[PDB]
Design a protein around this ligand. Sequence first.
Ligand code: NA
Ligand code: NA
Lengths: 120, 120
Amino acid sequence: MSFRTHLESVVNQVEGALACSVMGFDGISVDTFQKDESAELDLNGAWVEYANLLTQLRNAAETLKTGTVSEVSVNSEKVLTVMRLVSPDYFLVLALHADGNFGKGRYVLRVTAPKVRAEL
Amino acid sequence: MSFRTHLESVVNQVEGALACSVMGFDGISVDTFQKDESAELDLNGAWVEYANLLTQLRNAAETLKTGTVSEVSVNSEKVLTVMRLVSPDYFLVLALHADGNFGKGRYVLRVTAPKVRAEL
Ligand code: NA
Ligand code: NA
């Protein structure tokens, strides 16, 4: 959890950001920072779909290990995700509300991923 | 290829659009419309990465079959993709150049997917 300052930066910078996490390909979460301060909206619908996305995220994130693939997104009606490779064992996941800033999420995760890779 | 008029609409509407296709989960492509009119840019780098993305696309697109997942993106440095479910056997793939309009691609594919589902 040297990671956690970086995970917090992403969530603070991205409107509609629910959570930023480091996840293993073994399917075990390593670290997270979740938005606490409730947004104008009701996130509870988004949390339900976020929980329901977790199996699918880990499956799609496997494609990050190939040389060509640098970014994967697995999205529902209420939740958008962006994922990037950290190491052969770990990837970074940003979840945001469907009304959040997806373009800014993609940009902020791309800037942050090198800093997370440096904490290993 | 009742599909092809819909595939063409997507490519015409989206700046940086390389191709819009219908793909089976059996891994066999059904129909496509590719941009012919070369864009200001040199697409050849993008075509190389597009060809290299095809195995990974079909793998991530499997997650579209679950109820929660409505949209998947598998992206490289030069190519962005958006995918949506058409039927249990088929999905729709939009590929665009990294400098294209990703937000407009996502919007246009979401509008078009119902029309493609209607052609089955
Ligand atoms: Na990769
Ligand atoms: Na689905």
